[PDB]
Design a protein around this ligand. Structure first.
Ligand SMILES: *[C@@H]1O[C@H](CO)[C@@H](O)[C@H](O)[C@H]1NC(C)=O
Ligand SMILES: *[C@@H]1O[C@H](CO)[C@@H](O)[C@H](O)[C@H]1NC(C)=O
Ligand SMILES: *[C@@H]1O[C@H](CO)[C@@H](O)[C@H](O)[C@H]1NC(C)=O
Lengths: 119, 36, 89
């Protein structure tokens, strides 16, 4: 209108059959790794203070655990959703997707147990 | 169906490359001065 | 007929004809990956003697001397090059 209020909610029209519910509270290098193993849906993240323009920077960083959901959803696909400001206005963003594969790595733990290099 | 936005120019997506990426702690275990 | 008839509970009847609240519970085991477990009780924290311990399901025996190393604040274990548990939070 100086405030930011959300009006139109186009995700789904509605539902009947709800089985689980959770509630909480919600420049950037936010590096996420999602996992779904034996129903247990583990996610890792790293929030890093970058300041640059474009395509993926180099550099290394370990990832920390966040949450384990003992759900039993067999997730076969996904998608990303954003929000728009107002005829529409999206923004200008970068976000990368690459599927992981069952590889094998060698890790270099230091005395601090920080992973300082892997090959 | 539903209503959807138009005038959405689908520009063909492009590829990039990773650089030392996918390095996360595989488990909840501390180690020190080792290789695993 | 009418399928629904009313109850005639009266206070001055026999205890049989007086009402009883029936709470049925049907729970599942070994299926539908769980979020409700059974209850649990604790014991104390003893150190510096040759004792048995059980932390986070990990079983072992030995002397629980004070530790001198700090880990990352999510890690629970601490292990050597020979892959034997020798530290725990
Ligand atoms: C979900 O709800 C619909 C009614 O909206 C119902 O017809 C369908 O059987 C339900 N499915 C399950 C798995 O309960
Ligand atoms: C996944 O598949 C199993 C076996 O068919 C089923 O029991 C389970 O409900 C499914 N989970 C979901 C919601 O994807
Ligand atoms: C972790 O790093 C700090 C700073 O170098 C150091 O003082 C501390 O001794 C280290 N801890 C371990 C377990 O090596």
């Amino acid at each position: 209108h100086k405030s930011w209020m959300e009006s139109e909610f186009r995700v789904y029209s509605s539902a009947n059959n709800c089985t689980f519910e959770y509630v909480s509270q919600p420049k950037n290098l936010r590096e996420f790794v999602f996992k779904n193993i034996d129903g247990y849906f583990k996610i890792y993240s790293k929030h890093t203070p970058i300041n640059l323009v474009r395509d993926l920077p180099q550099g290394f960083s370990a990832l920390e655990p966040l949450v384990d959901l003992p759900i039993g959803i067999n997730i076969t696909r996904f998608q990303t959703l954003l929000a728009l400001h107002r005829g529409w206005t999206a923004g200008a963003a970068a976000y990368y997707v690459g599927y992981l594969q069952p590889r094998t790595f060698l890790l270099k733990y230091n005395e601090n147990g920080t992973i300082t290099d892997a090959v | 169906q539903c209503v959807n936005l138009t005038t959405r120019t689908q520009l063909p997506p492009a590829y990039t490359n990773s650089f030392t990426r996918g390095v996360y702690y595989p488990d909840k275990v501390f180690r020190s001065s080792v290789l695993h | 007929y009418f399928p629904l008839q009313s109850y005639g509970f009266q206070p001055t009847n026999g205890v049989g004809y007086q009402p009883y609240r029936v709470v049925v519970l049907s729970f599942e085991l070994l299926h539908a990956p769980a979020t409700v477990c059974g209850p649990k009780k604790s014991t104390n924290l003893v150190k510096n003697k040759c004792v048995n311990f059980n932390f986070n399901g990990l079983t072992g025996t030995g002397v629980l001397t004070e530790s001198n190393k700090k880990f990352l604040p999510f890690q629970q274990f601490g292990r050597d090059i020979a892959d034997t548990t020798d530290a725990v939070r």
